[PDB]
Ligand SMILES: O=C(c1cc2c(ccc[n+]2[O-])s1)N1CCN(S(=O)(=O)c2cc3cc(Cl)ccc3[nH]2)CC1
Ligand SMILES: [Ca+2]
């Protein structure tokens with residue numbers, strides 16, 4: 001995340017971190033239930049074996065709330081295309097169930113039509129992660145969050161050099177220097193309604209991070225709800 | 234002119250669907266619908282969608 005603020009205690013509890021062999025974060029995930037993590041398909045090629053850490057806010061210290069879980073099943077979307085990042089979504093089934101507790105708790109899945117007419121027409125959602133703090137920079141050691149405005153499909157297509165499919169939506173700022181960035185991918189984009197957070201997107205891609213006239217592109221979770229339901233069995 | 238689900242979410246806490254010409258409310262998994270048919274009551278600690286308070 002470029003810009004934004006730290007997630008304070010208890011504020012981003014649906015966040016998960018995929019960590020490689022070297023115990024280093026390479027991508028985010030969203031907690032869906034005690035066994036299922038939502039992530040981007042493109043993260044599945046950024047390492048050979050990986051685990052999932054939950055409950056972490058500062059990867060430089062063990063505040064005794066963290067847990068690592070091994071992955072049992074990976075369900076990648078069968079139409080993922082690496083060239084365009086279309087169908088950038090995957091579910092992970094964990095070996096052992098998550099224990100919910102402070103900083104660890106799932107985000108809700110919405111109903112499709114209600115989410116489209118009610119959630120995605122709010123002004124903003126929240127994206128969170130441990131990725132880079134600027135394009136050239138290093139990964140954050142603290143979990144960060146950023147409020148990002150939803151952007152008009154039309155404006156976004158005008159702004160992008162790559163094709164924005166119906167499986168994607170854009171969020172972020174034209175000029176303001178605030179955006180997700182590398183390492184944040186696969187992480188949550190959630191939308192608050194009254195006092196509950198629903199998962200609305202997955203951090204997928206951008207042309208750099210926080211560039212003027214570019215936005216962040218997120219997988220449109222609502223196009224995949226049936227598929228997610230299936231995968232969780 | 235805004236009616237049913239389009240008027241402040243049908244007074245529902247979470248999902249709102251217009252069945253016939255009236256509002257039907259419902260709740261995410263891990264919530265139950267209250268007797269007033271509108272509010273959603275968490276059935277455990279750590280319901281989805283809530284920042285953790287302990
Ligand atoms: O410019 C590209 C693209 C290559 C592409 C794109 C679209 C389609 C196809 N290709 O090959 S964007 N890069 C550079 C930037 N990085 S990244 O720093 O990992 C990154 C992920 C991300 C996600 C969001 Cl929501 C916003 C900014 C981001 N930067 C992402 C990759
Ligand atoms: Ca830590």
Ligand SMILES: [Ca+2]
Nearest residue numbers: 173174211214
């Ligand atoms: Ca921008």
